[PDB]
Structure formats: C-alpha cells, structure tokens
Amino acid sequence: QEDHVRSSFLLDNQNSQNTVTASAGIAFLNIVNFKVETDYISQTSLTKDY
C-alpha cells in the first residue's frame, strides 16, 4: 500500500487605510467667523486564497 497526500494552502491579505483631515478656522473680534472642515477616509481590503 502506497499513499501520498500533498496539501498546499496560501492566503494573502492587503489592507490600506488613508485618513486626511483638514480644518481651517478664522475668527476675528466677534465680526467674521469662518470654520471649514474636510474629512476623507478610505479603506481598501484585498484577500486572495489558494
């Protein structure tokens, strides 16, 4: 009796996260008030199995 068992498993995971926050606030002596905010969040996930 001859038995040959070969098992190969492969897994790859790549995750990229990017967060950009830009805030600008200009406040004079109770006359001019301008506040602006910009938030950008990106998340990319890639999974490969074999």
Partner 1 sequence: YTNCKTTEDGQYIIPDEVYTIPQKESNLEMNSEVLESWMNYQSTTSLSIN
> Shortest Cβ distance from residue 7 to partner 1 (Å)?
24
Per the CB < 8 A criterion, the answer to whether 21 and 39 are in contact is: yes
H-run or E-run covering 22? strand 11-27
> Shortest Cβ distance from residue 9 to partner 1 (Å)?
19
Does residue 37 touch partner 1 according to CB under 8 A? yes
Does residue 34 touch partner 1 according to CB under 8 A? yes
Phi-psi region of 31 (alpha: psi -120 to 50; beta: other; left: phi over 0): alpha
Q: Binders of partner 1: how many residues, by CB under 8 A?
A: 14
> Shortest Cβ distance from residue 23 to partner 1 (Å)?
11
